[PDB]
Amino acid sequence: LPAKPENISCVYYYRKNLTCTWSPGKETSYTQYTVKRTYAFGEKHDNCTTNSRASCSFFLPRITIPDNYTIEVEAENGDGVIKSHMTYWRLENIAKTEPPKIFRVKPVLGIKRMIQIEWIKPELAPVSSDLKYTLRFRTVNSTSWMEVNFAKNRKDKNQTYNLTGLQPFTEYVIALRCAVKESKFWSDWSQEKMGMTEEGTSDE
């Protein structure tokens, strides 16, 4: 018999593919794998297959978001078939986007100890979800990053952030990442962009 598949892990690369991997087990004779997916809150069924971590991918249009779906990996050899434990997933929780792109890093005119960052969302971005972001920043000197988190409502069109509490007349290197609110998979960091605070401390 095949070893029971386990360590099922899924990632939805937004509007590219859902991939589920798993630990296959012992490789005693040819093993054909079938990933059985139930999706759309239990109303639709898909599967993919692969052979000899093993890997299997699903595509639009057989993906809806948000969604609660299940995965079950069947492994078959000469002895016979074996099923994994059923696993249960929320697609929005494993949704990964590409990085945002910062296009402006400059103080608001006259405003001290702060930089305003403006960005565009990744080219593929779910308009229906609220976004969360981390902004990483450091002085040009520093060998170490500081981080701040913030969120934007889906209805919120203002794609700027006021980074405050900075040193006067200092250059900062900045990077931004995002994800849907519900997701545990951050985008990679954007490309880094530099900016500089104005002189002084009193607002003018």
Epitope: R15, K16, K44, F59, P61, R62, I65, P66, E123
Partner: antibody, heavy 121, light 109 residues
């Protein structure tokens, strides 16, 4: 903004083939399923097939599965529908339509303006 | 591998501005709430009004609403306006092949 601009009208003899194009702009082309649908004059809507431009995967209505080929060219953001072995009953307006609702796959949210293909002597 | 047939009724109807109108769509099998409704004005491409049986698409006036699940679906226009005289199609969006109802033409009395 999202736009699908199709190629111009075509007139074809019975037994010829026709290739219609659908140029997409205002979004990431590979991120969205592109469907093709036709409507004969004074008749209803008929689904022909779709393509996923991400990997070239296609899915055809079996009533036309043989005669229809849908392709997509990432480099130009253009989808194509070819219908082979034209007959007079294939006279129709041919539409491309993007499937765009994250919570509503298999629906047709943005349409091209359509292409009249007339099949006649 | 679906084999779902959609029929609509009435096939056409005549009504007046301000009327409430309801159109029906019937599927040959249980398709949950995977039904969409389109409006097609003379000369134009179809426009999506409703999907998942009752979610309004973007830029759809609130006088349009859909309901139903299983085999029986309705589209209701609460107060018919001039722009609304058009042909309405239902479609299942369960799985391929996608099929459409034959349409309901809403005409001016």
């Amino acid at each position: 903004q999202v736009q699908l601009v199709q190629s111009g009208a075509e007139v074809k003899k019975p037994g010829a083939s026709v290739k219609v194009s659908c140029k997409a702009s205002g979004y990431t082309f590979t991120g969205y399923i592109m469907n093709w649908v036709r409507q004969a004059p004074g008749q209803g809507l008929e689904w022909m097939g779709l393509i996923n431009p991400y990997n070239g995967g296609t899915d055809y209505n079996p009533q036309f599965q043989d005669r229809v080929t849908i392709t997509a060219d990432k480099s130009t953001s253009t989808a194509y529908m070819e219908l082979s072995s034209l007959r007079s009953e294939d006279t129709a307006v041919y539409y491309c339509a993007r499937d765009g609702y994250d919570d509503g796959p298999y629906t047709l949210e943005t349409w091209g303006q359509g292409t009249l293909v007339t099949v006649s002597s | 591998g679906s084999d779902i047939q959609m029929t609509q009724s009435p096939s056409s109807l005549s009504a007046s501005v301000g009327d409430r109108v309801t159109i029906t769509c019937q599927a040959s099998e249980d398709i949950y709430s995977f039904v969409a409704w389109y409006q097609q004005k003379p000369g134009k491409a179809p426009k999506l009004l409703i999907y998942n049986a009752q979610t309004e698409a973007q830029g759809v006036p609130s006088r349009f609403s859909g309901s139903g699940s299983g085999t029986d679906f309705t589209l209701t226009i609460s107060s018919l306006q001039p722009e609304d005289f058009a042909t309405y199609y239902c479609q299942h969006h369960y799985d391929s092949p996608l099929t459409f109802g034959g349409g309901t033409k809403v005409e001016i009395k």
